[PDB]
Design a protein around this ligand. Sequence first.
Ligand SMILES: CCCCCCCC(=O)OC[C@H](COP(=O)(O)O[C@@H]1[C@H](O)[C@H](O)[C@@H](OP(=O)(O)O)[C@H](OP(=O)(O)O)[C@H]1O)OC(=O)CCCCCCC
Ligand SMILES: CCCCCCCCCCCC(=O)OC[C@H](COP(=O)(O)OCC[N+](C)(C)C)OC(=O)CCCCCCCCCCC
Ligand SMILES: CC(C)CCC[C@@H](C)[C@H]1CC[C@H]2[C@@H]3CC=C4C[C@@H](O)CC[C@]4(C)[C@H]3CC[C@]12C
Ligand SMILES: CC(C)CCC[C@@H](C)[C@H]1CC[C@H]2[C@@H]3CC=C4C[C@@H](O)CC[C@]4(C)[C@H]3CC[C@]12C
Ligand SMILES: *[C@@H]1O[C@H](CO)[C@@H](O)[C@H](O)[C@H]1NC(C)=O
Lengths: 145, 804, 84, 40
Amino acid sequence: HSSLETQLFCEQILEKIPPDSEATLVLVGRADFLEQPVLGFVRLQEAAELEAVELPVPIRFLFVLLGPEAPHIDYTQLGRAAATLMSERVFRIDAYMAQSRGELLHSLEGFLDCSLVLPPTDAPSEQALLSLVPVQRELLRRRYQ
Amino acid sequence: KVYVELQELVMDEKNQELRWMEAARWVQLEENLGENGAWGRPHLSHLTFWSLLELRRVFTKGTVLLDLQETSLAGVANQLLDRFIFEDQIRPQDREELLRALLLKHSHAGELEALGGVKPAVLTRSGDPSQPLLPQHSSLETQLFCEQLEKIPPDSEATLVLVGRADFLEQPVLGFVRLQEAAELEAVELPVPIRFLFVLLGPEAPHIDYTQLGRAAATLMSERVFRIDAYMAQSRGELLHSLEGFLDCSLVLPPTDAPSEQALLSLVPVQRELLRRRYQSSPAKPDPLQQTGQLFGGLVRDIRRRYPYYLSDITDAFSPQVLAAVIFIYFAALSPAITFGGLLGEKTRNQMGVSELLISTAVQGILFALLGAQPLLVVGFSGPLLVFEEAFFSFCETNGLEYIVGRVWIGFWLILLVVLVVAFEGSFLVRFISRYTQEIFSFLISLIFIYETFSKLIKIFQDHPLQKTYNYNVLMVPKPQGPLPNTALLSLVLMAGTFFFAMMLRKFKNSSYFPGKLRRVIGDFGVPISILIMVLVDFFIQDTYTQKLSVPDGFKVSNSSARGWVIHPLGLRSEFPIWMMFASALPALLVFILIFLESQITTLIVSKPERKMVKGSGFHLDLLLVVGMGGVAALFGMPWLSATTVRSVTHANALTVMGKAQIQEVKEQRISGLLVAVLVGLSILMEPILSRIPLAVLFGIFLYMGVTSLSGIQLFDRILLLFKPPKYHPDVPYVKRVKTWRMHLFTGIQIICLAVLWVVKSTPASLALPFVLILTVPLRRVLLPLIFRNVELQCLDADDAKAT
Amino acid sequence: ALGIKSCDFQAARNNEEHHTKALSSRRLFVRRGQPFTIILYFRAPVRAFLPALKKVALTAQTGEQPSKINRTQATFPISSLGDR
Amino acid sequence: GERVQLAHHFSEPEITLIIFGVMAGVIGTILLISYGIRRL
Ligand SMILES: CCCCCCCC(=O)OC[C@H](COP(=O)(O)O[C@@H]1[C@H](O)[C@H](O)[C@@H](OP(=O)(O)O)[C@H](OP(=O)(O)O)[C@H]1O)OC(=O)CCCCCCC
Ligand SMILES: CCCCCCCCCCCC(=O)OC[C@H](COP(=O)(O)OCC[N+](C)(C)C)OC(=O)CCCCCCCCCCC
Ligand SMILES: CC(C)CCC[C@@H](C)[C@H]1CC[C@H]2[C@@H]3CC=C4C[C@@H](O)CC[C@]4(C)[C@H]3CC[C@]12C
Ligand SMILES: CC(C)CCC[C@@H](C)[C@H]1CC[C@H]2[C@@H]3CC=C4C[C@@H](O)CC[C@]4(C)[C@H]3CC[C@]12C
Ligand SMILES: *[C@@H]1O[C@H](CO)[C@@H](O)[C@H](O)[C@H]1NC(C)=O
């Protein structure tokens, strides 16, 4: 089936990329022979222009997510989560200075700590979405301080 | 809709006794209870990610008592704990203390203030509550919604969510109970029977906030799809399946360092699709310059844009800056009124004089402040209006015509003209006046103002030359009949002193000296302080003569034998000819173009986007008011006025609050202009005060206003850049994206236009200045693209100072 | 008309030539006494090369207080007559 | 008014009322003309 983001945003870069920008590559695939899903996180020692994957900016981070078909595991959505996590400033800073997996896991927990879940509400969409503006502002008043 | 109540095990403050206290309630929308004892503002429920993660974990291994035949909290708790032990969720040694906790007193908001408040508590093996060990986090709902019941349907059933912490527990436990028949319990004071019971007990654990756990369970119960599933579920798996769909249609919003409304509203299709997915399985179904093509459409939209802000237009004036602006603009509008009225009386043989101009300015300013869509404009006489008065007087005396009656008929035609223009939304032609014409006109008007002030000082020097000998017995009535010692030099000293003090206090406002608020105050009153200082200086020099402000003796016509307060359109002494009743349209035409151009260009300059005016400006209401008031005042032998540029710009600048170099806000209100107009009207009765104010102080004030009005003009900045080297040039789009010589060619073309307009103003044909100024619009719109690229024109001629 | 868009220091090639490639491929590490190559990019096309060359000089500084007497600051033109 | 003035048949309120009436009439005429056009 088609992804939700494609259905709601696709049926109908270098200018915006800042000069001192480094790329994160997220690789997502399904391998039926693997027993468990696996995550690989790579921070290169220095940003590199990988010839196999030409990007607008040099690659600094690599996310590898492989695994079999598992319950409640959508690998495209899993890659979207890892991509959004990289796009967030606080986790990205923690990823640059991370020296162990535990420091990365601590940053992910803080990312989940300052995360808002909107349940299915019957309210009008423009009111249901805009009701998150003051709640998110209070929830992020210390994360970016 | 149903009622859901969340109660948390807490200990009080007076007797340290643990009990249950309601923390939040749900009728679809969620209300929270603050520490003060009042319910907060109802809101849509938002859940933390950790609460839903933990709610799913306890619900997966949870305890479900469906269709349970009990009608009391004691009966429910006995059965709930009996199956807790049977499911190996709690040990039998824990049953005694857990039953004691559940059947406790359930307090509500009516006893929060009666007691000493509540603090969070953790149940111990001993009866006394333990103080929580994990770091406390104050509820986000209380901070955001609380620091400041008829919606329940008669047939609705309630749900009770109980959350409590007990240190003597291995893991958090969930108990779900659906009674066979909805019964009333002592826990809920509301007269609504209870069908469902959520019990969430467990130890202090990381990532588990039991208040958030209860909020998640109550939000899940408050959802329509889950509740229908809960009523029809005969097993735990059916409740689990409904929870999975609830999480499947949930929207998680990750943290971002740059929140915005537009990015948030990009998720409207996502929220709609998720809601559609949730209800696809349940049996329930989900519950100012534009032309509008309508007669008087611009006027009605102008009224609707500004009139709701009327309450703010009175309350926003309660600041000392407004009072200082009143004192400033009073002199800034009174001295030109006296000068132009004296010139009018001299030229028109006192048919129209100082008193008529004063009363007309007062009445029209009061009405414009009370009814105008842009109350920051100052309405008064101007130079071109004086030139028209002299030209019409010459024409009327040439063909033996009464001047004031011709003025009456010109105003009668003006009313028709402005009604036709407003009825056809003719003010939308103002949109073709870009930054080019606005800045050219503003620069020319400021230069004329400065030149006329210096010319007044020069004329003072010519009237009182510096000579070795003077006649000492010269007549002093009504003005110097000869040269006087020390007069011109003292006028120069007073003008220079007041200008210097005004500029020094302006720099003091932006300086870093004194308490900042006092410096801001002192700086706001800088012009009144300078005026007072130099008025005292001239006061203490008694021997020397300086020309003082002179106001009419009383509220009488400037010439008693020529006319009264009301003019007969058919004639005063001789019958007014029929042909001039129709021929007054052409001078009325010229007056309408003059007033329209001046007022609308002033409105464009004052209400620029970079000036930070959020209250809106009306281009249709103000033109109608000004021209109609002028046409009516013509019938009373009074001048028609216009929204002058220098006075309005000074008025807006005196109400502008500066940030910490950058415009922050403007005090847009109706009280300052109203008070200025009232003071102008009252100036006749303030003769003992105004008679001690010299004209040299006001000349220095005029020089200050002239040099101040050039602050926001990009033409002046580029003229400065002509004398300024390119490396110095600022980081602005017309410098960084346009070549320096192209920018200077643009500035030189504007300078040529300024020189042409100044030359035109120097000839007797100075009433053609509006048309030559209009000709700069075809220039920018046709000839400028023939030599400049679209990029260069976007950068140089920018409406809101944007880099294309 | 002599605005600068960017300057490429060519760290990979120069580090290879200067035997510092093991240090980095992104940061320019050079050894004294041996030439290294940079590429200067202009925002607009350069019409006259010789006047533009006459218009440009280069300055190299090291340390917190660079000066000529300490030999921590050198200003040199871009020309074929420079002391190699 | 003031001094010695010519006495017309209409007083000032009467003449200004008739002029306002004529102006309202011509304004309504132009408005009705504009309403007739842009429709047929
Ligand atoms: C006229 C006062 C007479 C002196 C009486 C003697 C008493 C006296 O006035 O000094 C103590 C008092 C200290 O109080 P304090 O430092 O808290 O007051 C600061 C002062 O108001 C600044 O002007 C403010 O900056 P700004 O401008 O608003 O941006 C600043 O706020 P912020 O913006 O930093 O948050 C304020 O905190 O004032 C002075 O600052 C020293 C200047 C002495 C003033 C001396 C002037 C001759
Ligand atoms: C910031 C505040 C302003 C600063 C600028 C100062 C301008 C002062 C006006 C001078 C021009 C003027 O007005 O001179 C003109 C006068 C009048 O000549 P007249 O032959 O009588 O006129 C002929 C017309 N009749 C026939 C009607 C009489 O000349 C004089 O009496 C000469 C004395 C000039 C004194 C200058 C004072 C010092 C100025 C320098 C200060 C830095
Ligand atoms: C737009 C305004 C100025 C109206 C246009 C003026 C013309 C159309 C009208 C307005 C009032 C009219 C006058 C009203 C009354 C009379 C008295 C009558 O015994 C002779 C004609 C005379 C004097 C009219 C002449 C035409 C007149 C002057
Ligand atoms: C006499 C005073 C008032 C104004 C004169 C300023 C004029 C003549 C000067 C000032 C700055 C100058 C510009 C500065 C820089 C450049 C870039 C160069 O590659 C071409 C010429 C050009 C575009 C110059 C043209 C001439 C210029 C526009
Ligand atoms: C007033 O008008 C009369 C006659 O119309 C005229 O003689 C007189 O000079 C006027 N007064 C003044 C001060 O000009």
